[PDB]
């Protein structure tokens, strides 16, 4: 009834009722058998007298097509299309708007209505008598193809056939709309129609029928290149000569379009423009200077040439030497352009070159004088844009070359001064000048600005007082660096800085005491005043106490809290011993209160400030504020955050070093928190060193209840009374060793007690572990030759049921020998040969000795260790060979000049074991961080890596492993050997059925392969090469062996699926070409079936194999423009049809 009342009111002869009925009908449509009424009512209101009702009717067509039967959409579209050709302009326009609205609301990717629209649009465009209908139809078709180009793939030839003849019509608007429509068509067209259009364009260009049409065709080619890009690359070899020929025609408008086409080609198809950059650059350089009416509308060609040069420079890194050879002088010489826009374009091109430059640097340094001479003339001009560009170039040039402008400061400063104090200058120009001055001052020696300080100070001081606050902030930023330059604290400067101190202080203090200015100026003023006090605070008079009181006042505000803390830190640590004592008493409690403000940066800053203030001003320390700061530490010493804990421990160490009388107050929560942190499994790096230093400092003080024995018992109580992590034992042992070396007079008793504890048979395994680790740590730095039974006890502890105690005994034997090398190392060397029963542990001890000994102290025994290791290389028991190989490799690092060639010598002559031994020992000299051995390895590793060709089975595997380690850790030493090692690596991926052996027992089959390890290592090397260096190997030989791998063993199958998934992202173009060959092994693996006489393990294994295979399949499927493939589409259809594959596909979803 409501819908009937609405339709009754929609013909009420009153505009208000019609408007309201249409409005609430539209609101409601946000019924069956009555849609035929509402549709006709809306299409009739489309011709109403009032405009508001027409607008409402047009907006109501949107939500109507989504709530009506598909049949009535056809009649709506038909009525709109037939009204678009009517004889009334208002109906035509309103119908065009309605049709655009209808097209917009249709869901993309619906097909019938698009075909119905196209059938009439083609005829409308084909007409050549009503231009307005042509323009409307072109707009409608552009809107249609913009979002629904995927559909109606069968109408593309007709659309092309109707569009192409319109590029000749007299009116240019038709041509422009046709170009837009053609671009949108090419965006999603087919292969044949694209070729037809390109051939038509080339044929029409070759004919050159009229001057007017040639511009249109060139514009069309440029638009096609912009829209498609990668689909036109295979036609530049024919396109470019035509535009090159047309560039020589004496028409100003034609040249600009050709240069724009060149720019589009350079930007959008980088792969296919490589052979033509040399001629595009030459044309652009020829037409930069084009001006036939001035001798020193022709500026458009110069603008286009500058834009094209900018585009060429911005996207070619490898042509930097050629750029600096040929295009830089022209750009420098064109800085004197008569016109502003062309000058700006030239400037922008040169900035683009400068950013690309980030040897090119040497050539830029050679070119600098010409740049300076050119900019000197441009820095004195009425225009502000030219000066802004000059300052931007100066800033970029200084940012690229730090010290480029050393010899040109005398000619550069007057321009900056002139721009700073000019009444006809904008805020942007002043900010740019100040930024350039700041950058110049930061990146140059202080001695070059000394003659120019007298000229620099007044304009900067005036700029500090500018009403606009941005200029004030920039002026303060410049002033801080000027203060640093005027009096360095790290160099012996002879400059006299007295006269300007008063000016700088006066200009900064007024900004400092403002209380109403913006926050940025507040922080900048605080920083500038801090720098002033730090650098030149000795020459100030009585203003220092007042300034420090202001600093105190700024410490209690949230906006400016961190900045003043950093300023106080800067002031405290200065060679000029400033007196902060009047501030310290009232300032320490506030800084202590900052420690509870749940902000990390504030905590770190206030901890640093407290540390420096305690260190430098200990004479005026008071117990009250020390207690105040000590009251908030315990919450900070925790394993959740380790940096704050390290800062707190450093503060405690400084307090113990400078104020030892206040350590009686750390016997409660602080010490408990420290001890608990000692047992944390996350203790490493700086925190451990800080803890050791704090313990060493605390022992020497002599406070009660904190002696050596008290700390030792508090450290070792939990172990003896009853630790769930192994790192806790190491940390406790390190702390005990630090305590022992702090006070050496009590060392022997503790060492003897530890020896008795490890010797005793009533002690648990936890006690023996800690005792051995503590003995090893103590013996590292303290000589322990006075203990006679130490070696006997340790060697007895070698034979124990537990593995942890055995490892601890080996580590302790290794660590003790470092303290007294001559007394202990011969003993270990003799014991390795004497007792065959215990050699896997003595070799580990020797490894520890080698890894943790001084270079100077291990030189004499190098020959003995080398002889023993090379004697023991040929050993039957594997595992004993790995440790000796590691020992040899780590010994190579000590004196690598002479040991490395001796290692290489065994490759030519030796047994099978020796070659594998040396190749394995090579890999232990490679680390991520740079090492002194790197220059030798880069030259020598070719001899080791040419062992990939070897009759021995194991040596090839060892060489592959070494190559993998080198690729993963330091790829810079294998990149140049890729061209000679890749074929051998690829050869190792073959099956080599000679080594395959099969063993039979009844109807059951078992296979054993002796080449599986080598194939796995080769595929691992390939995976590493993917991430390490993908731009130095062929991407087409790689895929062949990847395809070989997809039918290989289960582990290789998983690895190859992973590599395929990774390669779906990197260089997807190569995968798309090979996609036909890739899916066949995937489909074979996914559809295979196991025998019925098998246990559930094989079924499960095949299940995850299938899941991983179709995960790789989906990864391949996600590649753009890959669904339109024969094998891929067949596989998708088969997966959809087959329930077994569909279920597992849904499983990975």
């Amino acid at each position: 009834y409501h819908i009937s009342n609405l339709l009754e009111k929609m013909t009420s002869s009153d505009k208000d009722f019609r408007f309201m009925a249409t409005n609430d009908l539209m609101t409601e449509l946000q019924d069956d058998d009555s849609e035929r009424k509402v549709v006709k009512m809306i299409l009739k209101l489309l011709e109403d007298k009032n405009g508001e009702v027409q607008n409402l009717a047009v907006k109501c067509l949107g939500p109507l097509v989504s709530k009506v039967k598909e049949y009535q959409v056809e009649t709506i579209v038909d009525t709109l299309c037939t009204n678009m050709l009517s004889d009334k302009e208002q109906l035509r326009d309103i119908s065009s708007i309605g049709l655009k609205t209808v097209i917009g609301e249709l869901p993309p990717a619906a097909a019938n209505v698009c075909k119905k629209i196209t059938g009439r649009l083609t005829s409308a465009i084909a007409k050549q008598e009503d231009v307005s209908v042509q323009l409307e139809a072109l707009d409608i078709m552009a809107d249609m193809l913009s979002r629904q180009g995927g559909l109606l793939v069968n109408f593309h030839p007709s659309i092309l056939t109707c569009l192409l003849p319109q590029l000749t019509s007299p009116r240019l608007a038709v041509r422009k709309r046709t170009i837009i429509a053609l671009g949108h068509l090419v965006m999603s067209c087919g292969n044949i129609v694209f070729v037809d259009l390109i051939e038509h364009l080339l044929s029409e260009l070759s004919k050159n029928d009229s001057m007017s049409t040639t511009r249109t065709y060139i514009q069309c080619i440029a638009a096609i290149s912009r829209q498609a890009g990668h689909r036109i690359g295979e036609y530049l070899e024919k396109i470019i000569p035509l535009v090159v020929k047309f560039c020589n025609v004496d028409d100003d408008e034609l040249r600009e379009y050709c240069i724009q086409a060149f720019e589009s080609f350079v930007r959008r198809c980088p792969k296919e423009v490589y052979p033509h950059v040399s001629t595009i650059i030459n044309i652009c350089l020829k037409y930069l200077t084009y001006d036939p009416n001035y001798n020193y509308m022709s500026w458009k060609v110069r603008r286009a040439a500058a834009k094209c040069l900018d585009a060429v420079v911005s996207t070619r890194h490898e042509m930097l030497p050629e750029f600096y050879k040929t295009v830089s002088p022209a750009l420098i010489s064109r800085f004197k352009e008569r016109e502003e826009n062309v000058k700006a374009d030239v400037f922008h091109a040169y900035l683009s070159l400068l950013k690309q430059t980030r040897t090119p640097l040497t050539m830029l340094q050679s070119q600098v004088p010409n740049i300076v001479k050119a900019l000197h003339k441009q820095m004195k001009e009425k225009s502000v844009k030219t000066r802004q560009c000059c300052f931007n170039m100066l800033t970029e040039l200084v940012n690229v070359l730090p010290g480029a402008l050393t010899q040109h400061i005398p000619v550069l400063v007057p321009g900056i001064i002139f721009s700073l104090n000019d009444k006809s200058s904008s805020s942007n120009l002043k900010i740019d000048a100040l930024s350039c001055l700041y950058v110049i001052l930061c990146n140059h020696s202080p001695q070059v600005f000394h003659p120019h300080v007298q000229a620099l100070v007044p304009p900067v001081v005036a700029c500090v007082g500018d009403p606009f606050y941005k200029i004030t902030s920039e002026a303060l930023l410049v002033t801080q660096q000027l203060v640093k330059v005027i009096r360095p604290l790290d160099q012996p400067s002879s400059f006299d800085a007295t006269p300007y101190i008063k000016d700088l202080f006066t200009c900064t203090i007024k900004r400092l005491k403002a209380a109403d200015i913006d926050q940025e100026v507040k922080e900048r003023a605080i920083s500038c005043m801090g720098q002033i006090i730090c650098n030149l605070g000795d020459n100030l008079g009585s203003d220092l106490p007042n300034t420090l009181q202001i600093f105190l006042e700024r410490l209690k505000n949230e906006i400016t809290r961190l900045t003043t803390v950093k300023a106080l830190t800067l002031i405290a640590g200065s060679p000029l011993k400033i007196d902060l004592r009047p501030v310290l008493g009232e300032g320490v409690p506030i800084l202590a209160s900052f420690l509870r403000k749940n902000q990390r940066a504030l905590k770190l800053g206030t901890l640093s400030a407290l540390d420096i203030l305690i260190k430098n001003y200990s004479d005026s320390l008071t117990a009250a504020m020390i207690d105040a700061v000590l009251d908030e530490l315990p919450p900070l010493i925790s394993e959740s955050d380790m940096h704050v804990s390290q800062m707190a421990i450093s503060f405690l160490t400084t307090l113990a070093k400078v104020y030892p009388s206040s350590l009686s107050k750390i016997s409660g929560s602080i010490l408990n928190e420290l001890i608990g942190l000692v047992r944390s499994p996350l203790l490493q790096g700086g925190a451990l060193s800080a803890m050791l230093d704090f313990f060493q400092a605390l022992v020497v003080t002599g406070t009660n209840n904190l002696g050596y024995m008290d700390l030792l018992r508090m450290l070792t109580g939990p172990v003896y009374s009853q630790l769930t992590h192994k790192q806790s034992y190491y940390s406790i042992a390190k702390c005990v060793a630090a305590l022992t070396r702090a006070c050496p007079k009590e060392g022997p008793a503790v060492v003897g007690q530890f020896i008795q504890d490890v010797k005793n048979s009533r002690s648990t395994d936890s006690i023996r572990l800690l005792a051995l680790l503590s003995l090893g740590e103590v013996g590292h730095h303290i000589d322990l030759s006075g203990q006679l039974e130490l070696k006997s006890v340790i060697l007895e502890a070698f034979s124990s049921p537990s593995e942890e105690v055995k490892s601890a005994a080996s580590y302790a034997l290794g660590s003790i020998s470092v303290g007294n090398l001559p007394e202990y190392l011969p003993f270990v060397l003799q014991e390795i040969t004497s007792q065959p029963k215990r050699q896997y542990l003595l070799l580990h001890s020797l490894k520890e000795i080698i890894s943790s000994a001084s270079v100077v102290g291990l030189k004499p025994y190098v020959e003995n260790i080398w002889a023993l290791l090379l004697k023991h290389c040929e050993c039957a028991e594997e595992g004993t060979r790995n440790v000796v190989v590691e020992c040899l490799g780590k010994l190579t690092l000590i004196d690598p000049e002479t040991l490395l060639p001796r290692l290489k010598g065994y490759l030519i002559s030796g047994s099978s074991y020796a070659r594998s031994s040396v190749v394995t020992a090579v890999k232990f000299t490679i680390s991520d961080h740079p090492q002194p051995i790197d220059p030798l390895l880069k030259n020598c590793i070719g001899d080791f890596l040419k062992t990939l060709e070897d009759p021995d089975l194991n040596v090839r595997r060892v060489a592959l492993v070494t190559f993998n380690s080198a690729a993963h850790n330091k790829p810079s030493l294998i990149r140049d050997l890729l061209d000679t090692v890749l074929p051998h690596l690829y050869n190792e991926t073959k099956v080599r059925k000679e080594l395959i052996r099969e063993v039979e027992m009844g109807p059951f089959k078992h296979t054993v392969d002796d080449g599986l390890d080598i194939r796995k290592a080769a595929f691992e090397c390939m995976y590493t090469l993917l991430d390490s260096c993908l731009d130095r190997l062929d991407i087409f030989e790689f895929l062949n062996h990847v395809e070989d791998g997809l039918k290989d063993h289960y582990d290789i199958k998983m690895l190859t699926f992973l590599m395929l998934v990774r390669l779906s992202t990197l260089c997807p173009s190569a995968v798309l070409q090979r996609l036909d060959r890739l899916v066949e092994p995937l489909r074979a693996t996914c559809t295979t079936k196991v025998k019925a006489n098998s246990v559930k393990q094989e079924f499960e294994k095949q299940d995850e194999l299938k899941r991983s295979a179709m995960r790789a399949v989906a990864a391949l499927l996600t590649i753009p423009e890959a669904e339109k493939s024969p094998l891929m589409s067949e596989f998708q259809s088969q997966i959809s049809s087959n329930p077994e594959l569909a279920a597992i596909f849904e499983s990975i979803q």
């Binding site: 009153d14 208000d16 009722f17 408007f19 309201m20 409005n23 609430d24 508001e52 027409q54 607008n55 047009v58 302009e89 326009d93 309103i94 708007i97 655009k100 707009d139 608007a173 904008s426 805020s427 900010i431 606009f468 941005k470 990390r600 940066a601 380790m642 940096h643 996350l682 490493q684 790096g685 593995e803 896997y840 594997e878 595992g879 890999k923 680390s927 993998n964 380690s965 993963h968 850790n969 063993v999 039979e1000 027992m1001 009844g1002 109807p1003 059951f1004 078992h1006 599986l1012 796995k1016 290592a1017 991430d1027 582990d1051 998983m1054 690895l1055 699926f1057 992973l1058 393990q1097 499960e1100 995850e1104 991983s1108």
Partner: protein, 715 residues
């Protein structure tokens, strides 16, 4: 007894890696069958004892091995035992087919199939006393791999598979998926704990020594490596747990540092770092909101700062204002598209920021109104369209137009300036006008475009009438001067009637002729002439040389008067020209400022005389320049008209709503008015209240008796 010896001898050969003939296999099968023919418990115990003894004396070899040695031993022995157990199960199919099936149904407790018996014996004999060593060695090898070493992954995979298979229930005897009790309770928990510890140490150590930018690359590489490990040599069930744990420990604990670094990366443009941050934080659930808020605040601040730096010059320079807005919008739109993958939330943040600083900024504060931005946009459009890249800048302007709250000001100003551009033929191109009309059709409604097209219709009608008037002159006496006219509808144009004027006698002929012609062709129509918009060209013959000068009709009237006398009084020039005080004063000042009329304050006592002698550099000189205060007065008038139109529109909307809904409340009426008028401007509540009050006084709607704050329509 004798039978069992043969079975023992044959089976001991099965558990060695030596092939046996199929005949021997069938021979063992036949002896097993013969032993079967309850009494099968003895044979079951015999096999159980043999397996226990074999595992017990095999374990003695691997008790003292360490590190990779125990892994190699376990893997090789497990593979050999697995194959041997499969062969043994193949041999003893009769027993597990009949006797075990009979025992299971009748209610036995410790009877299993041969393969399951072998697995249970392995688990209870060799797996139990070696699992600690095997797991610790596997963890040590994983840690070695994580530090940059190449290891043998086939040792870990075998251990993992052995752990997975040794998890059979042994009591249910029926299952669908794989049981992971041993795998989770012996390996997985320790593996995840070690991973957490390793990464929570490494991330802290790296962040304490390096900036965040390198840490992001480190984290991405670590995540890729972890995917590699879990997909290569681990079970498929730990993938999700490992991914979540690694993502948490590598990203979620450093969100404060990431948020701090986001602002620094925004300050100094670094798009790659922003993209990497977006990629990293996208994995954490609900982790992108803070970034969106920070980006919105940054864009708002950047726009405000960019507008503020222009200063007072932006109040009268539309180009600078619009270019600054366009530069900010283009830069941040490119940043959003490139680094943030065109996400909806970041687009919404950009739109919110743009709408915030376009309407309220420093320029609007100087003008004390938010309507200055549409005025400046319209003036920029007029400058563009007055006398290739035009399409792009028009499109950009139209993008800016989307964020304007009050679009009626823009519409009014654009209509007035288009009327000015049409009445005087100074337009760059008609194609640009058509393009702008189409763009306004797309953005604005349809009434505005029809109102605009009416002017084009009138211009076309006038163009048609001009030539046909020219034809009528040929068949009659001619005119001394070239004459062009433009007749426009009074109600379709914003032009107002001219002031008092006395037509110079040199122009009365054309006036009379055209008045007669128009009265003849059209009846019932009256023409009103605007002499403040009419312009012409004058030629002089009393200077040093012949000049032609183009000037307005007022300037002709006050200049042709000096043909009779060389000197004149401004109090008499008024009577000569019948021009008001202010307009005459301004036009006289304009004429004087050109140095072509020599004698600043003008009074009736002032004397003005024609200046001969000095001339102009060029032959054609234009003296029709606009007055300074005229533009300001026009702007004030067209700003007042907008407010009046707003009041009228609010009244009309209220009247329509009351006609449709007979009885309505107050808040509902306000909401309906706001939602009806939202497309043009946002009204204020006091304005709506005043409109309601003035509508009450006109007897349109009345407040109902009782139920206060409720209105009702009245006819």
């Amino acid at each position: 007894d004798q039978i069992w010896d043969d079975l023992r001898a044959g089976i001991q050969q099965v558990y060695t890696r030596q092939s046996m003939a199929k005949s021997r296999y069938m021979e063992l099968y036949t002896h097993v069958y013969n032993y079967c023919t309850f009494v099968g418990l003895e044979l079951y115990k015999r096999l159980k004892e043999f397996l226990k003894n074999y595992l017990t004396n095999l374990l003695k070899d691997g008790e003292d091995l360490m590190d990779e040695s125990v892994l190699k031993f376990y893997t090789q022995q497990w593979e050999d035992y697995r194959f041997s157990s499969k062969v043994l199960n193949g041999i003893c199919a009769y027993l597990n087919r009949h006797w075990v099936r009979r025992e299971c149904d009748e209610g036995r407790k410790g009877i299993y199939e041969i393969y399951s018996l072998a697995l249970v014996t392995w688990r209870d004999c060799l797996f139990r006393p070696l699992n600690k060593q095997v797991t610790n060695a596997v963890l040590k090898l994983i840690e070695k791999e994580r530090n940059g070493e190449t290891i043998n992954t086939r040792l870990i995979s075998g251990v993992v598979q052995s752990y997975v298979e040794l998890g059979l229930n042994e009591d249910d005897a029926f299952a669908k998926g794989p049981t992971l009790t041993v795998y989770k309770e012996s390996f997985e928990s320790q593996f995840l704990a070690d991973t957490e510890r390793f990464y929570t140490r490494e991330s802290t150590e790296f962040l304490q020594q390096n900036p965040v930018t390198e840490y992001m690359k480190k984290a991405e590489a670590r995540l890729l490596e972890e995917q590699r490990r879990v997909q290569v040599y681990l079970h498929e069930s730990t993938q999700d747990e490992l991914a979540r744990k690694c993502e948490q420990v590598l990203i979620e604990k450093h969100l404060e540092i990431f948020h701090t670094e986001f602002q620094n990366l925004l300050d100094a443009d670094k798009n790659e770092d922003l993209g990497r941050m977006y990629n990293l934080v996208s994995r954490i659930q609900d982790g992108l909101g803070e970034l969106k808020k920070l980006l919105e605040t940054h864009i708002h601040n950047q726009g405000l700062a960019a507008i503020e730096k222009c200063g007072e010059a932006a109040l009268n320079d539309p180009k600078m204002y619009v270019q600054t807005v366009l530069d900010v919008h283009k830069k941040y739109n490119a940043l959003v598209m490139s680094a943030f993958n065109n996400d909806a939330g970041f687009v919404a943040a950009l739109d919110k920021a743009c709408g915030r600083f376009i309407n309220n900024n420093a320029v609007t504060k100087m003008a004390q109104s938010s309507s200055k931005s549409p005025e400046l946009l319209a003036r920029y459009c007029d400058s563009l369209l007055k006398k290739a890249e035009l399409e792009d800048t028009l499109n950009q302007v139209m993008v800016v137009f989307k964020y304007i709250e009050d679009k009626d000001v823009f519409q009014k100003f654009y209509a007035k300036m288009l009327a000015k551009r049409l009445v005087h033929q100074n337009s760059a191109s008609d194609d640009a006008e058509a393009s702008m009309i189409s763009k306004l059709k797309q953005a604005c409604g349809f009434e505005y475009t029809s109102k605009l097209q009416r002017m084009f219709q009138d211009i076309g009608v006038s163009k048609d009438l001009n030539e046909q008037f020219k034809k009528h002159l040929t068949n009659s006496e001619p005119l001394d001067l070239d004459f062009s006219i433009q007749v426009l509808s009074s109600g379709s144009w914003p032009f107002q009637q001219s002031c008092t004027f006395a037509l110079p006698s040199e122009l009365e002929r054309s006036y009379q002729r055209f008045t007669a012609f128009y009265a003849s062709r059209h009846s019932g129509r009256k023409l009103t002439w605007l002499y403040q918009l009419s312009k012409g060209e004058l030629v002089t013959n009393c200077f040093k040389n012949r000049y032609t000068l183009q000037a307005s009709t007022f300037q002709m009237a006050i200049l042709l008067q000096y043909n009779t006398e060389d000197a004149y009084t401004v109090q008499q020039l008024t009577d000569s020209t019948q021009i008001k005080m202010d307009i005459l004063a301004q036009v006289l000042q304009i004429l004087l400022k050109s140095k072509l009329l020599v004698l600043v304050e003008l009074k009736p006592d002032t004397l003005i005389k024609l200046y001969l002698g000095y001339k102009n550099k060029k032959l054609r000189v234009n003296i029709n320049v606009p007055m300074k205060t005229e533009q300001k007065q026009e702007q004030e008038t067209t700003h007042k008209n907008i407010e009046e139109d707003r009041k009228l529109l609010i009244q009309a909307a209220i009247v329509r709503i009351m006609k449709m809904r007979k009885v309505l409340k107050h808040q509902q009426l306000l909401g309906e008015v706001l939602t009806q008028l939202s497309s043009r401007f946002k009204p204020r509540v006091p304005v709506i209240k005043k409109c309601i009050d003035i509508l009450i006084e006109k007897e349109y709607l009345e407040r109902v008796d009782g139920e206060k704050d409720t209105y009702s329509y009245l006819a």
